[PDB]
Amino acid sequence: STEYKLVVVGADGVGKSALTIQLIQNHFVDEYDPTIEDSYRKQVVIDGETCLLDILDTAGQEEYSAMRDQYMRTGEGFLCVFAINNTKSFEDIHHYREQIKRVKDSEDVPMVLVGNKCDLPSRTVDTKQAQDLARSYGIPFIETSAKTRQGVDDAFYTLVREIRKHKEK
């Protein structure tokens, strides 16, 4: 096996917890405490390699957290998640990205832009607007639904692929 430290960031309510639980336990949760931040370990084979993905599902935290601090030091890749029916969560994306660059002290940090809740019909964030933003950053964009599981494995697999390519350079 090979270890990858991933972090899932994005506005409250975008579906970070639902995406992680769907990946880990293969189930969709309608409700998961928005204040809980925790780490998960997904065991899956990617491109032949057995990978152990330690994933930090983030939540708002004021007081110091040793687990959050460990991911601030060792986190290799980030899923920046917004919800396609929430323009405000899309507006936050550039701030999450700029902050990540400062955390890693690097202009090149493995990252994937995720547009979640793609099962919903009342779309307010255009796919073109998200694809343009992802193109401007030089990163992949993946539309997901934690509800149907659409794109969930792609989002995490692609991030692992990005970390592998960054490590090659």
């Binding site: 960031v9 983030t58 708002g60 935290q61 004021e62 601030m72 936050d92 701030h95 999450y96 700029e98 902050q99 400062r102 955390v103």
Partner: peptide
Amino acid sequence: AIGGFGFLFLD
């Protein structure tokens, strides 16, 4: 205190 927010209180 690393901004922008982004993640709140990231120091």
